[PDB]
Amino acid sequence: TTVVVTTILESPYVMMKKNHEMLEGNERYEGYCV
């Protein structure tokens, strides 16, 4: 001398929305875990 949530791309828990290019941040994803 914002909470970082780690997750995995597994359907249907976390998936990339179809239009992720246009989206940033949390909005890029959708699913049960989102």
From Swiss-Prot:
It is found in: Cell membrane; Postsynaptic cell membrane; Postsynaptic density membrane. Induction: Down-regulated in the pyramidal cell layer of CA1 in the hippocampus by global ischemia. Palmitoylated. Depalmitoylated upon L-glutamate stimulation. Ubiquitinated by RNF167, leading to its degradation. Detected in forebrain. Detected in dendrites of neuronal cells. Expressed in the pyramidal cell layers of CA1 and CA3 and in the granule cell layer of the dentate gyrus. Ionotropic glutamate receptor that functions as a ligand-gated cation channel, gated by L-glutamate and glutamatergic agonists such as alpha-amino-3-hydroxy-5-methyl-4-isoxazolepropionic acid (AMPA), quisqualic acid, and kainic acid. L-glutamate acts as an excitatory neurotransmitter at many synapses in the central nervous system and plays an important role in fast excitatory synaptic transmission. Homotetramer or heterotetramer of pore-forming glutamate receptor subunits. Tetramers may be formed by the dimerization of dimers. May interact with MPP4. Forms a ternary complex with GRIP1 and CSPG4. Interacts with ATAD1 in an ATP-dependent manner. ATAD1-catalyzed ATP hydrolysis disrupts binding to ATAD1 and to GRIP1 and leads to AMPAR complex disassembly. Interacts with GRIP2. Interacts with GRIP1. Interacts with NSF via its C-terminus. Interacts with CACNG2, PICK1 and GRIP2. Interacts with GRIA1 and SYNDIG1. Part of a complex containing GRIA2, NSF and NAPA and/or NAPB. Belongs to the glutamate-gated ion channel (TC 1.A.10.1) family. GRIA2 subfamily. The M4 transmembrane segment mediates tetramerization and is required for cell surface expression. The postsynaptic actions of L-glutamate are mediated by a variety of receptors that are named according to their selective agonists. This receptor binds AMPA (quisqualate) > L-glutamate > kainate. This is Glutamate receptor 2. It comes from Rattus norvegicus. The gene is Gria2.
